[PDB]
Amino acid sequence: SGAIYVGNYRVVNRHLATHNDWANLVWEDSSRDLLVSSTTAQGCDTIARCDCQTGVYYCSSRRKHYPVSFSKPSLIFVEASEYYPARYQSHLMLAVGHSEPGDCGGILRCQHGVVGIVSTGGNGLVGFADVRDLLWLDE
Ligand SMILES: CSc1ccccc1CC(=O)N1C[C@H](C)C[C@H](C(N)=O)C1
Numbered sequence: 001s002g003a004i005y006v007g008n009y010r011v012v013n014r015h016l017a018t019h020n021d022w023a024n025l026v027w028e029d030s031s032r033d034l035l036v037s038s039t040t041a042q043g044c045d046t047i048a049r050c051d052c053q054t055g056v057y058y059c060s061s062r063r064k065h066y067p068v069s070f071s072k073p074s075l076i077f078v079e080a081s082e083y084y085p086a087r088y089q090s091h092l093m094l095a096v097g098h099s100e101p102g103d104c105g106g107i108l109r110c111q112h113g114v115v116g117i118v119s120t121g122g123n124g125l126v127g128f129a130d131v132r133d134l135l136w137l138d139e
C-alpha cells in the first residue's frame with residue numbers, strides 16, 4: 001500500500017484504489033496503473049521535475065529503504081493478474097532490488113522529490129510508475 005499526497009490530490013496504484021478514490025476520481029490510466037483522486041486536505045509531498053536515474057525507495061516487505069539505479073520511463077510488458085490482462089504498462093521504470101505485490105504504493109524519491117510509486121516487480125527487479133510528467137499535480 002502507499003499514496004502520494006500533493007495539493008488537493010491523492011495518487012495511488014489504480015489496482016489498489018478504494019470506492020472513495022473512484023467517487024472523487026480526477027484521472028486514471030490502466031496502462032500506467034495510476035489513479036488520482038481529490039482530497040479535502042492539502043498535501044505536502046514535492047513532485048520531482050527531473051530526469052534522475054538514481055534514488056531511494058521504500059520496501060514495506062523489508063521495512064527498509066533501498067538506494068536504486070532505475071531505467072528511463074518506458075513501455076514494458078507485464079504478465080496477467082487479478083487486476084489486469086497481459087499487457088504493456090507505459091511510463092514504467094525498472095530497477096534491481098527487492099519487491100513483493102504488497103510493496104505497491106511504496107514511494108521512490110530522488111534529491112528533487114517524489115519520482116513515482118512501486119507498481120510491478122520481478123526476479124530481483126522492481127518497477128515504479130513514473131509521476132514526474134504529470135505537471136498538473138503542482139497546479
Ligand atoms: C511490486 S509488484 C510484484 C513484485 C514481485 C513479484 C510480483 C509482483 C506482482 C506484479 O508485478 N504484478 C501484480 C501487481 C499487483 C500489478 C502489477 C501491474 N502493475 O500490472 C503486476
Ligand SMILES: [Zn+2]
Nearest residue numbers: 050052110112
Ligand atoms: Zn531528480
